[PDB]
Enzyme design. Structure first.
Site, mmCIF file in Angstrom:
data_model
loop_
_atom_site.group_PDB
_atom_site.id
_atom_site.type_symbol
_atom_site.label_atom_id
_atom_site.label_comp_id
_atom_site.label_asym_id
_atom_site.label_seq_id
_atom_site.Cartn_x
_atom_site.Cartn_y
_atom_site.Cartn_z
ATOM 1 N N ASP A 97 0.784 -1.215 0.000
ATOM 2 C CA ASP A 97 0.000 0.000 0.000
ATOM 3 C C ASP A 97 0.835 1.294 0.000
ATOM 4 O OD1 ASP A 97 -2.156 -1.674 -0.057
ATOM 5 O OD2 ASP A 97 -2.926 -1.156 1.958
ATOM 6 N N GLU A 182 -10.865 -8.221 0.744
ATOM 7 C CA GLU A 182 -10.996 -9.653 0.848
ATOM 8 C C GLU A 182 -12.024 -10.043 1.895
ATOM 9 O OE1 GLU A 182 -6.781 -9.960 1.342
ATOM 10 O OE2 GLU A 182 -6.542 -10.914 -0.622
ATOM 11 N N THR A 338 -6.812 -14.856 -4.385
ATOM 12 C CA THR A 338 -5.761 -13.836 -4.489
ATOM 13 C C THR A 338 -4.259 -14.236 -4.363
ATOM 14 O OG1 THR A 338 -5.844 -12.603 -2.384
ATOM 15 C CG2 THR A 338 -7.592 -12.151 -4.005
ATOM 16 N N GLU A 376 -5.299 -14.051 -8.630
ATOM 17 C CA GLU A 376 -4.243 -13.036 -8.808
ATOM 18 C C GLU A 376 -2.957 -13.549 -8.230
ATOM 19 O OE1 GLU A 376 -5.714 -9.873 -6.361
ATOM 20 O OE2 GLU A 376 -7.532 -9.575 -7.519
ATOM 21 N N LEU A 379 2.071 -11.366 -4.821
ATOM 22 C CA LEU A 379 3.140 -10.375 -4.732
ATOM 23 C C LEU A 379 3.718 -10.087 -6.074
ATOM 24 C CD1 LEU A 379 4.869 -11.857 -1.642
ATOM 25 C CD2 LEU A 379 3.666 -9.672 -1.654
HETATM 26 O O1 LIG Z 1 -5.694 -3.000 -6.042
HETATM 27 C C1 LIG Z 1 -6.328 -4.167 -5.523
HETATM 28 C C2 LIG Z 1 -6.065 -4.478 -4.052
HETATM 29 O O2 LIG Z 1 -4.649 -4.679 -4.005
HETATM 30 C C3 LIG Z 1 -4.114 -4.899 -2.677
HETATM 31 O O3 LIG Z 1 -4.616 -6.087 -2.075
HETATM 32 C C4 LIG Z 1 -4.202 -7.289 -2.686
HETATM 33 C C5 LIG Z 1 -2.992 -7.899 -1.948
HETATM 34 O O4 LIG Z 1 -1.847 -7.048 -1.947
HETATM 35 C C6 LIG Z 1 -2.629 -9.246 -2.518
HETATM 36 O O5 LIG Z 1 -1.491 -9.721 -1.875
HETATM 37 C C7 LIG Z 1 -3.784 -10.166 -2.304
HETATM 38 O O6 LIG Z 1 -4.086 -10.463 -0.947
HETATM 39 C C8 LIG Z 1 -3.575 -11.351 0.136
HETATM 40 C C9 LIG Z 1 -2.790 -12.683 -0.271
HETATM 41 O O7 LIG Z 1 -3.697 -13.669 -0.812
HETATM 42 C C10 LIG Z 1 -1.973 -13.334 0.932
HETATM 43 O O8 LIG Z 1 -0.983 -14.314 0.498
HETATM 44 C C11 LIG Z 1 -1.223 -12.261 1.721
HETATM 45 O O9 LIG Z 1 0.171 -11.946 0.955
HETATM 46 C C12 LIG Z 1 1.173 -12.417 1.859
HETATM 47 C C13 LIG Z 1 2.124 -13.422 1.216
HETATM 48 O O10 LIG Z 1 1.405 -14.586 0.915
HETATM 49 C C14 LIG Z 1 3.320 -13.649 2.143
HETATM 50 O O11 LIG Z 1 4.274 -14.527 1.615
HETATM 51 C C15 LIG Z 1 3.940 -12.295 2.346
HETATM 52 O O12 LIG Z 1 5.301 -12.338 2.741
HETATM 53 O O13 LIG Z 1 3.069 -11.599 3.240
HETATM 54 C C16 LIG Z 1 1.841 -11.236 2.564
HETATM 55 C C17 LIG Z 1 0.874 -10.889 3.640
HETATM 56 O O14 LIG Z 1 0.576 -9.558 3.772
HETATM 57 O O15 LIG Z 1 -2.105 -11.200 2.139
HETATM 58 C C18 LIG Z 1 -2.727 -10.463 1.055
HETATM 59 C C19 LIG Z 1 -3.622 -9.361 1.600
HETATM 60 O O16 LIG Z 1 -4.543 -9.700 2.562
HETATM 61 O O17 LIG Z 1 -4.878 -9.565 -3.018
HETATM 62 C C20 LIG Z 1 -5.310 -8.277 -2.495
HETATM 63 C C21 LIG Z 1 -6.505 -7.788 -3.329
HETATM 64 O O18 LIG Z 1 -6.278 -7.752 -4.716
HETATM 65 C C22 LIG Z 1 -4.464 -3.700 -1.818
HETATM 66 O O19 LIG Z 1 -3.905 -3.691 -0.513
HETATM 67 C C23 LIG Z 1 -5.941 -3.515 -1.749
HETATM 68 O O20 LIG Z 1 -6.195 -2.452 -0.877
HETATM 69 C C24 LIG Z 1 -6.496 -3.289 -3.157
HETATM 70 O O21 LIG Z 1 -7.930 -3.225 -3.040
#
Ligand SMILES: OC[C@H]1O[C@H](O[C@H]2[C@H](O)[C@@H](O)[C@@H](O[C@H]3[C@H](O)[C@@H](O)[C@@H](O[C@H]4[C@H](O)[C@@H](O)[C@H](O)O[C@@H]4CO)O[C@@H]3CO)O[C@@H]2CO)[C@H](O)[C@@H](O)[C@@H]1O
Length: 490
Positions: A97, A182, A338, A376, A379
């Site tokens: 973010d 989510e 996601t 999706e 990362l």
């Molecule tokens: O613009 C659309 C939205 O984008 C962002 O939210 C997205 C997340 O950034 C994206 O990662 C995903 O959500 C979750 C993952 O499924 C989950 O794995 C985790 O990511 C981990 C990762 O797995 C781990 O290895 C790493 O080191 O730590 C991460 C944990 O934070 O959490 C994610 C988020 O809960 O999809 C999201 C939606 O598209 C923006 O933040 C959102 O505000 C936007 O609306």
């Protein structure tokens, strides 16, 4: 049947903040050069947050859709389709973010005086990034309930963008249902410390959730039962907790009861809001979709701590995702999963991560309930490794050279359209990824050709009772995956 039947569309997320907090579309020219790059690469469409906190900023029902109208116009000029997120959450405290976008000030004002409108942890920390499920139906927001707020918003969006809707620019409406949009609890808030392979904390301590919990236990016959108090903190490991260790509280009656209550609050939260979305978009040529987070850490231990915690009641003997999929079925919605890119071996061993297994479980459950499944990458990734992983997940059994594949995803939305992506070597790789998603075919502008025509949204099917939903907790064996994609980027 034709190879085109093997096509899986690819979308690209737009940068966060392409419309700033001031409700200004900052750089149309810049964006434009970017979009034009994506169109030449063969990308099908793009995805964008429609921030609640920008649109209804001024006061209740004071919508200003102008800057988003401009953006959608430009997207349309560039020959791309569009996936719109009803983002009812804040931008800022989550991984990646780069911009802060909060929920409406006027809502925040209310919370200044009713702190219990936010998710709250056991220590009493209030997370302001999303309103707690506990207030879905409390008419404390100037006469409206939270669900009414969301609903009104989507109606407004529908009426005000009807021209774009009917010209077929918007193909899916993703309904934001929690943090990061989510359907989950904010159990792992970076804004509170949380760090990767930590288990997270239960987020049911606000007063409404606590009162609901207490009444429910009393009806069960255990008025005395309390919310968990031995679950540890954000960065614990399970074995270090009373709740999650073996033979811990999680496998007691009390714990099971709790976990069921907690996970069911999500299911009903999602069901009710999708009901509202269905009515708002009824008749429109779009599909609805929700986002389910990929919590792969602790997946390989019996307790699945991080999953429970986030509100996914998933164990080795209790499928906690398939019920979500069944819930989606009455609404004809898509499950947008996601996290699609990760390999088990890229995780630290101590996190007991099972990303590939988690993936097969979730997609299989969806396919099994006969709903559409999308996903999706979690990362930012630019390497063939990640791409080939997404391709495998997209068509788990490979391409069918004489018909439609037996298993395929409905679409994949690549994570973020940045300068880095457009760099020459990165972009060249991407182009290939796009080609192989397309099954070696050129971009296909009419989706009807690859069996993706969108029909007018119908009304939701009738409410499925919680019991029936909960039957889908019966474990099933996943479908068989190939070990490698037959359509690699290398
Ligand atoms: O613009 C659309 C939205 O984008 C962002 O939210 C997205 C997340 O950034 C994206 O990662 C995903 O959500 C979750 C993952 O499924 C989950 O794995 C985790 O990511 C981990 C990762 O797995 C781990 O290895 C790493 O080191 O730590 C991460 C944990 O934070 O959490 C994610 C988020 O809960 O999809 C999201 C939606 O598209 C923006 O933040 C959102 O505000 C936007 O609306």
């Amino acid at each position: 049947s034709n190879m085109l039947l093997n096509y899986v569309p690819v979308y690209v997320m737009l940068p966060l903040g392409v419309v700033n907090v001031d409700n200004v579309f900052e750089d149309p020219d810049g964006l434009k050069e970017q979009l034009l790059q994506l169109r030449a690469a063969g990308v099908d469409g793009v995805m964008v947050d429609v921030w609640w906190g920008i649109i209804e900023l001024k006061g209740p029902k004071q919508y200003d859709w102008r800057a988003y109208r401009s953006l959608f116009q430009l997207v349309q000029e560039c020959g791309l389709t569009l996936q719109a997120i009803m983002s009812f959450h804040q931008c800022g405290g989550n991984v990646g973010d780069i911009v802060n976008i909060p929920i409406p000030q006027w809502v925040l004002d209310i919370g200044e005086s009713n702190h219990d409108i936010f998710y709250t942890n056991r220590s009493g920390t209030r997370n302001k990034e999303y309103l707690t499920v506990g207030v879905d139906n409390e008419p404390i927001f100037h006469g409206r309930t939270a669900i009414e707020i969301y609903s009104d918003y989507m109606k407004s969006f529908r009426e005000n963008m009807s021209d774009f809707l009917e010209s077929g620019l918007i193909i899916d409406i993703e309904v934001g249902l929690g943090p990061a949009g989510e359907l989950r609890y904010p159990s792992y808030p970076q804004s509170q410390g949380w760090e990767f392979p930590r288990i997270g904390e239960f987020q049911c301590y606000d007063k409404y959730l606590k009162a609901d919990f207490k009444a429910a236990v009393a009806r069960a016959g255990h008025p005395e039962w309390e919310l968990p108090d031995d679950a540890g903190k954000y960065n614990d490991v399970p074995e270090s907790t009373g709740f999650f260790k073996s033979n811990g509280t999680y496998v007691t009656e009390k714990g099971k009861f709790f976990l069921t209550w907690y996970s069911n609050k999500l299911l009903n939260h999602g069901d009710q809001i999708l009901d509202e979305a269905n009515k708002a978009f009824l008749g429109c040529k779009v599909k609805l979709a929700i986002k389910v987070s990929g919590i792969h850490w602790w997946y390989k231990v019996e307790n699945h701590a991080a999953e429970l915690t986030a509100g996914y009641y998933n164990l080795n003997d209790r499928d906690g995702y398939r019920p979500i999929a069944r819930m989606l079925s009455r609404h004809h919605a898509i499950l947008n999963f996601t996290c699609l890119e990760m390999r088990d071996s890229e995780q630290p061993s101590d996190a007991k991560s099972g990303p590939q297994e988690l993936v097969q479980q979730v997609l299989s459950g969806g396919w099994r309930e006969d709903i559409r499944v999308a996903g999706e990458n979690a990362l930012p990734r630019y390497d063939a490794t990640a791409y080939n992983q997404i391709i495998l997940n997209a068509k788990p059994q490979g391409v069918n050279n004489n018909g439609p594949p037996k298993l395929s995803m409905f679409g994949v939305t690549y994570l973020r359209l940045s300068d880095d992506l457009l760099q020459k070597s990165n972009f060249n790789i991407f182009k290939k990824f796009v080609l192989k998603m397309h099954a070696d075919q050129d971009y296909c502008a009419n989706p009807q050709k690859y069996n993706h025509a969108i029909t007018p949204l119908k009304p939701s099917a009738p409410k499925i009772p919680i019991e029936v939903l909960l039957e889908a907790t019966k474990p099933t064996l996943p479908f068989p995956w190939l070990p490698e994609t037959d359509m690699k980027v290398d």
